[PDB]
Amino acid sequence: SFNQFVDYTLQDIICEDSTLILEQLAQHTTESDNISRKYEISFGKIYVTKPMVNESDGVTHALYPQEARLRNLTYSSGLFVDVKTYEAIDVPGRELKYEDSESGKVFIGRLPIMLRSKNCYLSEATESDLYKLKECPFDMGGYFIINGSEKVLIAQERSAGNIVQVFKKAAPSPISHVAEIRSALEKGSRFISTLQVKLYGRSSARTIKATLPYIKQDIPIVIIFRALGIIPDGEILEHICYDVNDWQMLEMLKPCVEDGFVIQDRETALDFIGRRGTALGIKKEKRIQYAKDILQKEFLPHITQLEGFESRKAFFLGYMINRLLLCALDRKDQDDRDHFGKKRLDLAGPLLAQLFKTLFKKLTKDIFRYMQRTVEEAHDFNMKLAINAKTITSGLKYALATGNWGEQKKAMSSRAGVSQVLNRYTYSSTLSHLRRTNTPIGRDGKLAKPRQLHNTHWGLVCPAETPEGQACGLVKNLSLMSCISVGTDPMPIITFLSEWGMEPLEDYVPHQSPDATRVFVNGVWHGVHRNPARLMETLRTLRRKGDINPEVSMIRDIREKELKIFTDAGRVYRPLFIVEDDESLGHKELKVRKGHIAKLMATEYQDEYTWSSLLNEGLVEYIDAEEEESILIAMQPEDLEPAAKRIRATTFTHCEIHPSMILGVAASIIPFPDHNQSPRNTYQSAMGKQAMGVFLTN
Amino acid sequence: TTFRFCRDCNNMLYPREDKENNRLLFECRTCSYVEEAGSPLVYRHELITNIGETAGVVQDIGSDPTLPRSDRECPKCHSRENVFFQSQQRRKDTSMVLFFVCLSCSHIFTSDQK
Amino acid sequence: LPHFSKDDYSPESKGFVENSYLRGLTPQEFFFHAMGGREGLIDTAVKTAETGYIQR
Amino acid sequence: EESLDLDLERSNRQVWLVRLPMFLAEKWRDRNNLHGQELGKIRINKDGSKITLLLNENDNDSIPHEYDLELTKKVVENEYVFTEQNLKKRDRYIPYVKTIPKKTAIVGTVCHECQVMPSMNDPNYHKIVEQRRNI
Amino acid sequence: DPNEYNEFPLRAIPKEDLENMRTHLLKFQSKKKINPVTDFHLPVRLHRKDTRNLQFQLTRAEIVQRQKEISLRRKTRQLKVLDENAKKLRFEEFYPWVMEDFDGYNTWVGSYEAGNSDSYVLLSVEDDGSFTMIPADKVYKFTARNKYATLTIDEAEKRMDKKSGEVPRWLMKHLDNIGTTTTRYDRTRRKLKA
DNA sequence: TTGGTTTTTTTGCACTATATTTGTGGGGAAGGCACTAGTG
DNA sequence: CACTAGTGCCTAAAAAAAATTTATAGTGCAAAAAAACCAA
Ligand SMILES: [Zn+2]
Ligand SMILES: [Zn+2]
DSSP states (O other), rough: OOHHHHSSSSSSHHHTOOOOOOOOOOSOOOOOOOOBBEEEEEEEEEEEEEEEOOEEEEEEEEEOHHHHHHHHOOOOEEEEEEOOOOOOEEEEEEOOOOOOOSSSSEEEEEEOOTTTTTOGGGOOOOOOHHHHHTTTTTTOOOEEEESSSOOOOOOEEEESSSSEEEOOOSSSSSEEEEEEEEOOSSSHHHOOOEEEEEEEEOOOOOOEEEEEETTOEEEEEEHHHHHOOOOOOHHHHHHHOOOOTOOHHHHHHHHHHHHHTTSSSSSHHSSSOOOSSSSSOSSSSSOHHHHHIIIISSSTTTOSSSSSSHHHHHHHHHHHHHHHHHHHSSSOOOOOOOSSSTEEEEOOOHHHHHHHHHHHHHHHHHHHHTTTSSSSSSSOSSHHHHHHHHHHHHHHHHHHHHHHOOSSSTTTOOSTTTOOOOOOOOOHHHHHHHHHHHOOOOOOOOSSSTSSSOGGGGGTTSSSSSOOSSSTTSSSSOSSOOOEEEEOOSSSHHHHHTTTEEOOOOOOOOOOOOOOOEETTEEEEEEEESSHHHHHOOOOHHHHTSSSSSSOOEEEEEETTTEEEOOOOEEEEEOOEEEOOOOSSSOOOEEOOEEEHHHHHHHHOOOOHHHHHHHHTSSSEEEEEGGGGGGEEEESSSSSOOOOOOOOOOHHHHHHHHGGGGGOHHTSSSSSSGOOOOHHHHHHHHHHHHOSOOOOOO | OOBBOSSSSSSSSSEEEEETTOEEEESSSSSSEEESSSOOOOOOOOOSOOOOTTTTTTTTTTGSSSSSSSOOTTTOOOSSSOEEEEEEEOOOTOOEEEEOOOTTOOEEEEEOOO | TSSOOSSSOOOOTTTTTOOTTTOOOHHHHHHHHHHHHHHHHHHHHHHHHHHHHHOO | OOOOOOOOGOOOEEEEEEOOHHHHHHHHOOSSSSOEEEEEEEEEOOSSSSSEEEOGGTTTTTSSSSEEEEEESSSSEEEEEEEEEOOOOOOOOSSSOOOOOOOOEEEEEEEEEEEEEEEETTTTOOOOOOHHOOO | OOSSSSEEEEEOOOHHHTTEEEEEEEEEEOOOOOOHHHHHSSSSEEEEOOOOTTTTTTOOHHHHHHHHHHHHOOSSOOOOOOHHHHHHHHHTTSSSSEEESSSOOOEEEEEEEEESSTTEEEEEEOOOOOOEEEOOOOEEEEEESSSSSSOOHHHHHHHSSSSSSOTTTTTTHHHHTTTOOOOHHHHHHHHOOO
16 A cells, blocks of 8 residues: 555645646736736656764764664654746737746745655565564564654555445435445546435335535436437437336436426526525626536546536436436345445555645645745745645654644544554564554444445455444454555556457447446446457456456446446455366366475475466466455365265355465464354454563564 | 337436327427327336346356356256256245256246246 | 356255355355355444444 | 528538547548548448458557458437538517527538447457557 | 449549648538438528527518627736647637528528547549549538427526426417417418518 | 415424443644844 | 854734534524414
């Protein structure tokens, strides 16, 4: 997580908002003219340093973890970034063509570093050199050193965004079925932008209304479709219903069609007020320009937000309406909030990203200040950034030391459990404190929600290593091989998909596609395809060949005629053996053979196959928590592969590498956990961390 | 129970009665187009039904692994291979009836042993 | 569980513990036992505070 | 000076809209190119129903010299190419509407929607397969 | 290969010819085939006009008939950056493309979709047999309007108010009997009669 | 005949209060200028 | 004579991207809308 946050997401977060200009042309017409006094400042490449800290009145030392640890330092390193007039002039008539550094790589602050990260001294040490530096070689683990105290951050699980969900609200309320969408931009302005559509009446007031910012009335969806640019009602019907043969949905839509029977033009529908403010600018009643700017810039911050993709919005909204309508028609059941796959695990990367974004916005706002102040001479470019560096470093230090998460905002929105102090009693405990999770639910707690274990938790989170009391079922612990998703750019994937034959939704038509399959990527609809099978196998083969980052996961919901692609960051996945159904030797067989494992043993005893070297040639494949709903698993490599102690289909695709690996760190110590009652195993898992012994060697 | 739309514009044709000729007419309440009524049927409700069980019967049903396979034969091709699954209508008052589709005959038939 | 064929109601498929502690469980049965234990733990861990309030 | 009404004369010309792969589109959409030079040859069956492209050797054998053109829509309706340029310098009606006039003329009718795909059998082909695999 | 085909190398359009000239793609949403040369009543004018109150706008024939009958600053400011091409696109699209024939029989309103404008490339056969290669900068989509004599916004706002549980199922029929807001073709026909 | 009238019924919304014991330990706690004194 | 720190004195950092989900009870205001009387 940290390595990703350092290599990228930092140059990105800067080059994204590296624009700031004060071109004081004349601040009023003329003044003849005057010159376009551009004050252009922009940030180029950034730089990072090794931990390099000077004391008072002295030279800078090359730090080392033990040095900071005993001297109560912060094992951080500094930063400095490059900073970048020639004009265009215009008196009034003509116009529309009327459009600095003072230093280089100016210091901007210092930020803490992850131990044994890419830029940590220890990440290259040899055991001899490692002892020369005097720290235990068993100290595998990325904690933090703040003011001389080992410091650890903990994962925060959250519901995944940009994904359709439906709920059945309680009977007394005039809403019976609701669908909600969350959104984000990673993570400008936080772009919460909740979208929700409510189904009214039981009463038989069957009508569908939607809530959109900044419109403060419930709006009939037909008006929304018309305002988007779809006038003829039949087209709107085509956007909701897909099997023209079926009718029921049309019957329940009938009242909704009746509601919008009065308006018949797109801008007239746009002319609806939905005021909510702000102060009415140029207006007659409501600018059509205002409405369209809303619907483009702010509406649905996912699939697109620029100017010109009304049709994509229409199709996605119709899809969501259809999903809502199914739940009211009982064709498909209620959504499951507590299913694990539709959650994510925010980690060090994203958290540091959030804090850095906030503090850098504060930075930029302060930069604008004292530049407008210097109406007279001159451009500083030097000294204000020193106080700015103090601010950035102080903010990072405070966040990582206090546990509050955010600036000094009087503990607003500051969930404290983010920067707990690392436990150091037993090596078992220490390891059992790194791979740790936490979610906010409440103070006291409910008793029908995720506290109890879930089926989806299989093989991802240890089913016994939990604390008890007021937090039971909240804190949970990753299983052994479970790994987290660091995300990847989807653009190459979508370009490849389009190249291999895609129907862009701009020219989709249900009539000519009575069986074609929808395609989703990170919860964005992009197109529809005829043959899903060949595309599925091709993507699978290309992944296995190693031409796509294996973290990517795809699912073909053949029952729902759907295809999903996921490449976000924060998913949880586990390894698995791949099983080829075909076999020249006969029935069925998992692809790996004895030669590969012999090579593995030879490589190990050499003191050149790696796990990666197993991955490339297609022998094991990562599986996220979402896919399992489309895979059959064989517990034993011989359970049914061919044709007293204890009690012991033919379409397997993957076999578990070993069952005993569903545990976590602490439970692994328990001998024969099968042969005793589960709560007793939980008692031991919790208790073992309270045992003495050794914790390091140094 | 199907709905017709105006040839001049895709809009729902509302039924309306001929006062003197006493036959139902469908007029496009948007534009002056009017249309004759095929059947005396106007609206259909079906409060309780047993339909929708054949939903999502794709030609690639047999492709997926996770649907279990049985040994019952289809009474068209008699091939013992087949794929079976229970009712698609997810309501508490459903039935334990199953549906057998056979890859060879590509046909769907009930599990009713009667 | 993703190790089973879909739409099965056999006791093993839907979580009947067959074996006894003496021989030892099987992965699935182990998971189900864990589920039951977690249920008991959480229910007591909530009822304690609740019923304390009622008692007071 | 110029008539504001658009020209309807140039309509009667059949047009083939072509979706083009990214690598080849990058080259041909360049403004530096398009000097009028010939770039490739087309092959049409007397029976029809199969169209392939014969690219000239100006590609520097970095991309296939043969491609197959698949008519996604053999028949096309209501699609046309119109060209734009600058001009020379209850009964209540709205007098002012702020018309903005441009010089416009319709120049062709789209009749064939087709896509260029590299023939996998082409010797220079399947190289862009690895190129797309890397990206 | 045996000569079962017509081979001819397609040739590019001259570069110097291209500049100062913009080529766009035109689209109609209609179930029935429409031929602009035949169906439309020449002369036909393409203008970029504001679309507010399209019905109240007089027809080109109507306009011609009317013509014949007549015969402190805050001093401190900061501007957020926006892409220059995006700004130009916004400026160009501030007014929609609207095309009318002289009769006013058929009116169409264009819109811009950026889904596939860049990737698509124009190819039309030259007279010599070459195929003209044009990079298509923008693709515009035109939709019909006012054919069914749409109702106006204000009365619609009054109707949507819950004065009545349901609006009159024959409200449009009654309005057409009153003939309020006649079609642009209808208004042009009335003006020609007068 | 029906709308102004008083009466009633409802709907919302805005309130509070959330078992008992014990022990560490880890944090900081006003920052932001202002006016003068020593040193270069 | 000028620059910066060292200590003492003293009001503001005023920016909005958002509203963020975490319940469940009851129950007294408070206002919103329906429902009876009758009078113009
Ligand atoms: Zn009609
Ligand atoms: Zn059969």
